């Protein structure tokens, strides 16, 4: 049984989302529907993605480094490799383990990309003991086509390129080819302007061709888990949610065991979330997507008042998940 | 039952160690014994540590940054805070969530510290929408005393300082107080030419609170660490007290009823050739019946894990083990 997968701590600070590695604080309904495969597991113990269920490092040993500058000094470093070139990755060759499943957002100095996934790391050659010191910086990472000359964002893995561009200047850029990329897997959100939205929007998510999509069933609507993720802006400048398909502990549990016997298609495994006032049910589909009986609502659900989580059991997907939330109570 | 906590995938691919977030490939016995509290959970659903059961970004906003040297550029950036100053951390104020439980290894440019814990990040001022860009670099993070003038390693939290120093030069150093440290939780091992450390951290390098329970031999049973392959800068192994999935499971539920002190929950690990028993204490430490042997057990040929149930800690855990395709 998958009942163990979700317990109160998972939604009360133990749990981090599977995309940004930020602490989960809210549930975000997605009536429009969405698709996710990276670091996302199904009840069949499988992923259509390219990443293990952890946030370690993103490494690719065979990429091409370039920069566009009149001068070598103070340029934005660029690196890219073709999707499907990550031969060192056991899970999939589409991209290096932990590479973010978001479409690349193109930008030029002195601007920073809106709603970009950003990580810390740099250019590292396989033959070298250390990364090129001059290149270590915050980098936006994304999927794109047309690198390096005509970058375009893409949400389809096939024919894509895995690209990285520093959002802040590196003291000296490099043109080395081939050369490696090393970036930490836990990301921050780059925004020039204070937005309030959530990232990524469904249109930004990159998936493989076979990836199953999440769509509303009756009054039940797919949800993403909203996390607190640090935001990075204009340098030298005085100073919101990140969303993931699954809580990481759930993702890890699904990876560990095959749950085919427990659930059948047309069924959701259900848990009840109890708040100081009221309660709601959320359901997990066979494809690993979570649902709430929120219908058309896009309002974020605050987890601050969450008191308890307990299993309900397998239930028909067609049956409306309970949504009975009444402010704030000390109870 | 805690039987569910350990399954074959945890030790054969999926499992990542709780210290480095590397992929677990082996079991390393520690005859001398050791202690660990950070990102370590017991069967009472508790930690003596300062970290959540995940690799949370290391964020401390009230630290002091400075650098030492001839000029403001190509200098090693330094940041420090007193242990017990992590007020924003709900778990403990000892250190920021995800700060490594390793004693700081002092070093001078152009050298990289031997067996240092290294993470990527930079100085970030709270009033600023971005980090000080000149400072993003790889940093050694550790517990020390004497900051910033006379750094010395320490394995005790009391009177300690949580410290960071870049192992490679920063474009331009910064002097600010207070200012934040922002470093990713997953770490890389710093290895200098020569030195040749077999695995890190060694027991004498681990930082713990005064209240942390020690892991010591019980009969022929010896406490073990989980060995993982960790990216290195400068075959070297990174070790953690627990597989993270186990740490997460322990955090999720209270297993106090399940086991009694002086008892181990036991599983049998079946290998292509031979088998062995592994036990988990109430303190959350893992044991093998290796006695004084220090052989790295290769989990590559592990084929199955099955629960045995509670057994007295004193009773010997069975140990019955070239290269085989099979």
Author numbering:
A (entry chain B): 238 to 433, 435 to 477, 484 to 570, 575 to 579
B (entry chain A): 238 to 471, 483 to 569, 575 to 579
Paper text:
The etiological agent of RHD is rabbit hemorrhagic disease virus (RHDV), which has a single-stranded, positive-sense, polyadenylated RNA genome of ∼7.5 kb. Mature RHDV virions are spherical, non-enveloped particles with a T = 3, icosahedral capsid whose outer diameter varies between 32 and 44 nm and whose structure is defined by characteristic, cup-shaped depressions. The only capsid protein present in RHDV, VP60, is composed of three domains, which include the N-terminal arm (NTA), the shell (S), and the protrusion (P), the latter of which is further divided into P1 and P2 sub-domains.
Furthermore, the P domain of VP60, which is responsible for antigenicity and binding to host tissue, varies considerably across different Caliciviridae species, and hence this stimulated us to crystallize and obtain a high resolution crystal structure of this domain to provide a model that is more reliable than could be gleaned from any homology modeling approach. In this study, we used cryoEM methods to reconstruct the structure of the RHDV capsid to an overall estimated resolution limit of 6.5 Å (5.5 Å in the shell domain) and solved the crystal structures of the S and P domains of the RHDV VP60 protein both at 2.0 Å resolution. The asymmetric unit of the crystal contains a dimer of P domains. We find that RHDV VP60 has a P2 sub-domain that differs from other caliciviruses. The P2 sub-domains of RHDV, NV, SMSV, and FCV exhibit no obvious sequence homology, and the Cα coordinate r.m.s.d between the P2 sub-domain of RHDV and that of NV, SMSV, and FCV are 3.00 Å (38 Cα), 2.68 Å (123 Cα), and 4.32 Å (107 Cα), respectively. We identified seven regions of high sequence variation in this sub-domain that dictate the binding specificities of histo-blood group antigens. When we superimposed the crystal structures of the RHDV and MNV P2 sub-domains, we found that the L1 and L5 loops of RHDV correspond, respectively, to the two loops in MNV. The crystal structures of the S and P domains of VP60 were docked into the high-resolution cryoEM map to construct a pseudo-atomic model of the complete RHDV capsid.
